[PDB]
């Protein structure tokens, strides 16, 4: 019971996070254009 609370403590305190983001939908939202813009940014 003391090993379930120590486990939830070191795992919630992960050193780095890189949160992955996907962009998708309809073509000519300037959609590829949007991607390009993002890249440029």
Report whether 31 contacts 25 (CB < 8 A).
Answer: yes
Residue 30 among known ligand-binding residues = yes
Q: Tell me: is residue 27 an annotated ligand-binding position.
A: yes
Q: Is 26 annotated as a binding residue?
A: yes
Dist CA 36 CA 32 (whole Å): 6
31 labelled ligand-binding: yes
Q: What resolution in angstrom units was achieved for this structure?
A: 4.9
Could you give the angle at the alpha carbon of 33 between the alpha carbons of 32 and 34, nearest 5°?
Answer: 90
C-beta separation of 23 from 34 below 8 A: yes
What Cα–Cα distance (Å) separates residue 38 from each residue in 2, 5, 32, 33, 41?
Answer: 46, 41, 10, 9, 5
Tokens representing residue 30 in the block: 């300037």
Distance (Å) of CA 29 to CA 3, 9, 13, 17, 41:
50, 43, 38, 30, 18
Rounded to an integer, what distance in angstroms lies between the CA atom of residue 32 and that of residue 23? 10
How was this structure determined? It was done by cryo-EM
Tokens matching residue 2 = 């003391």
Q: Is 32 annotated as a binding residue?
A: yes
């Amino acid at each position: 019971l003391q090993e379930k609370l120590a486990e939830e403590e070191r795992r919630k305190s992960l050193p780095r996070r890189p949160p992955v983001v996907v962009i998708m939908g309809h073509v000519d939202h300037g959609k590829t254009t949007l991607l390009d813009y993002l890249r440029k940014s």
